């Protein structure tokens, strides 16, 4: 896709832990 | 994201 | 002399090291360890074709 989702290290680390727990959703805003 | 693990 | 000096430590970023490109802005390579990024976050960002990472300096801007 054309969209680009930008992660900080903090966000990536947090996302990663959630993914392992099956929490895969993040809410788009801008 | 582009890493050293990127295929 | 390094071709891709780490954005944090300034040592060469080699192909056999975990490292990520600041695609958000500055386009320097950064060793995963230098950034404080976990192995799991690194594998996740690698697998996310639509995701890019930004270093702390670039994200703060
Ligand atoms: Zn480094
Ligand atoms: Zn940067």
Where are chain C's structural domains? Answer: 1-61
Neighbours of chain A (3+ CB pairs under 8 A): C
* Second-level CATH architecture of C1-61: 2-Layer Sandwich (3.30)
C25-50: b (≥16 Cβ within 10 Å) or e: eeebbbbbebbebbeebbebbbeeee
Method: X-ray
Give the Cβ contact number of residue A9 at 10 Å. 22
Token pair listed for C56: 């702390």
C6 and C29 Cβ atoms separated by less than 8 Å: yes
Tally the domains of chain A. Answer: 1
Q: Least CB-CB distance to C40: which of A3, A7, A20? A: A20
Quoted resolution (Å): 1.7
Cα atoms in the Cβ-side hemisphere of radius 13 Å centred on C58? 21
- DSSP collapsed to 3 states, chain A: CCCCEEECHHHHHHHHHHHHHCCCCCCCCC
């Amino acid at each position: 896709g054309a969209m680009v989702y930008v992660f900080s290290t903090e966000m990536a680390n947090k996302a990663a832990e959630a993914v392992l727990k099956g929490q895969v959703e993040t809410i788009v805003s801008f | 994201a582009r890493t050293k693990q990127t295929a | 002399m390094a071709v891709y000096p780490c954005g944090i430590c300034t040592n060469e970023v080699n192909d056999d090291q975990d490292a990520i490109l600041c695609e958000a802005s500055c386009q320097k390579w950064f060793h995963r360890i230098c950034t404080g990024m976990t192995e799991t976050a690194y594998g996740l960002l690698t697998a996310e074709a639509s995701a890019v990472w930004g270093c702390d300096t670039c994200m703060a801007d």
